[model samples]
Target chain A: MRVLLIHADYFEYEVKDKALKNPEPISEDMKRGRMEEVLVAFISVEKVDEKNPEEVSLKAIEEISKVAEQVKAENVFVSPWAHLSSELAKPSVAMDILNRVYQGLKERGFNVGKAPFGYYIAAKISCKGHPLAELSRTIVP
Target chain B: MRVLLIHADYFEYEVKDKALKNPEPISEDMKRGRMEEVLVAFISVEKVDEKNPEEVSLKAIEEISKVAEQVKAENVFVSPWAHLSSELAKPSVAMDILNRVYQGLKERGFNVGKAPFGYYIAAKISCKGHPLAELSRTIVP
Candidate 1:
């Protein structure tokens, strides 16, 4: 999995269209989200992640948690960005990996906002751009 | 013109497809750009800017220049973002406004990088996320 984490002062996203045949069911609030002081994680599940989604997901979540704490951010935005990698996993596996990270963050007591899986997202984000504000990570089982 | 500025450690963009009937002719280098220690200015030319493109463009450039100076940035990426406003100008006028802004900055002695106008932009950006890292501005004649 590839993850690009940014600590943002403000971030908002609105779902535009389904990018997959079997997109996740989204609630009204999930369709549009706006939050401040968030650690926005733009993630892409690669082809290799499918072989061991659980381990990769857990590793990514741990990395994200570490960054969130490092940046002194409380909110987490799990933004699915398929463009991060060319070797993408199937949508089903991608969904699973994303859910693991999202739910894992929530369980760890982070206020998490999730971008629905398999959608074209329109977003307006302002990253704080401090020294520890942005990080990119690669995870594998 | 509506502008959203980000002070980034690194920023890169690639042109995806034409978003306008009359897209700018892009050179090979214009099609993709990557820069570090830069100020990324995402701008949308509105209908109001069309009437006085020069004045609005000049005013917006002045504003951006001020921010660049405040952030101690030497490089700039003039990224066109039509999503910033509901009322957009004609594509021709937008091209004009953006060009004016781009050339104005270069004339002002900043190392300027431009994203081609009227193209679907795919970008990977990491904002430094400092106190003065992100700012939103509206410019009018």
Candidate 2:
């Protein structure tokens, strides 16, 4: 799993159009919404990540928790962005991984905002300029 | 020329791998470096921008300066990211436009850093989440 984490001062997004031919429907609030002082995690679940989805998801969540603490972020915004890689997991698997991450983060007592898993969104994000503000991690477990 | 400006706390990158078939050689400094409090501009130079490259370059600089000031960014990092659009300028024209933008920014007394054009780089960027942290603009000459 590849994760691009942005420690943003705020993130606002709107689902503009369907990027893929068939996209999953999103909630009304998720259709257009914004959050302030959040950690926006742009995630790309690759093919190999499906082998141990549970393990990978847990590891990714753990890493994100550490990053969120480092940046003093109380909210998390998980956005599915496939552009990070050419080789992607099956849609079902990708969505499953995203669901797991969202659930895990919520269980960890973090305010979480999840963008629609399979749609294209137009977003405006601001990142605070701290040393650990932006980080990219590739997890293989 | 279309520019996607991302105001980041810090931007760190390295040319760990090559993306193009025949990539241009890069300076050792560009091989690995990091900048703080930067406006990381991901640029996609369209074919039309090349017709009046000089004019477009100047216009882009003026626009970026305003954004940098709004974000209070002292550093500007110009990155060539062609993935923003499907219609891209020819390789030579794109590189030329990038060079012009870099030179124009420097001439205007902006602290500028440029990514090695035509190569795939690994980058970590943190974007500040404010009203103006992320902006997309199209320069027309």
What are the candidates' individual DockQ scores? 0.03, 0.06
Q: What is the TM-score of each candidate against the true structure?
A: 0.54, 0.56
| Model 2: lDDT of residue B106 | 88
Q: Which residue pairs in candidate 1 have backbone atoms (N, alpha carbon, C) closer than 3 angstroms, thus clashing? A: A128-B129, A128-B130, A129-B127, A129-B128, A129-B129, A129-B130, A130-B128, A130-B129, A130-B130
Tens-digit lDDT track of model 1 for A12-108: 7667667667788977877887889999898879999999989998899899999998888899999877545668898889889899999999998
B3-99 in candidate 2: lDDT tens per residue? 7788877888777556667777877776977889899888889888868988888898889989988888889999987645556898888888889
Q: Which ranges of candidate 1 are over 4 A from the true structure? A: B1-141
Across A9-112, the per-residue lDDT of candidate 2 in tens digits comes to 77787776676688887667658878898998988899998799999999989999999988888999898876455578999999999999999999988999
Model 2: residues >4 Å from true position, as ranges?
B1-141
Which ten residues in a row are the worst by lDDT in model 2 chain A? A125-134
Question: Which candidate should be chosen as best, given DockQ against the real structure?
Answer: 2
> What TM-score, to 2 decimals, does candidate 1 have?
0.54
Specify the poorest-scoring 10-residue window by lDDT in model 1 chain A.
A126-135
Docking class of 2: incorrect
Model number 1 iRMSD: 15.1
- lDDT of each model, Cα atoms only? 0.81, 0.80
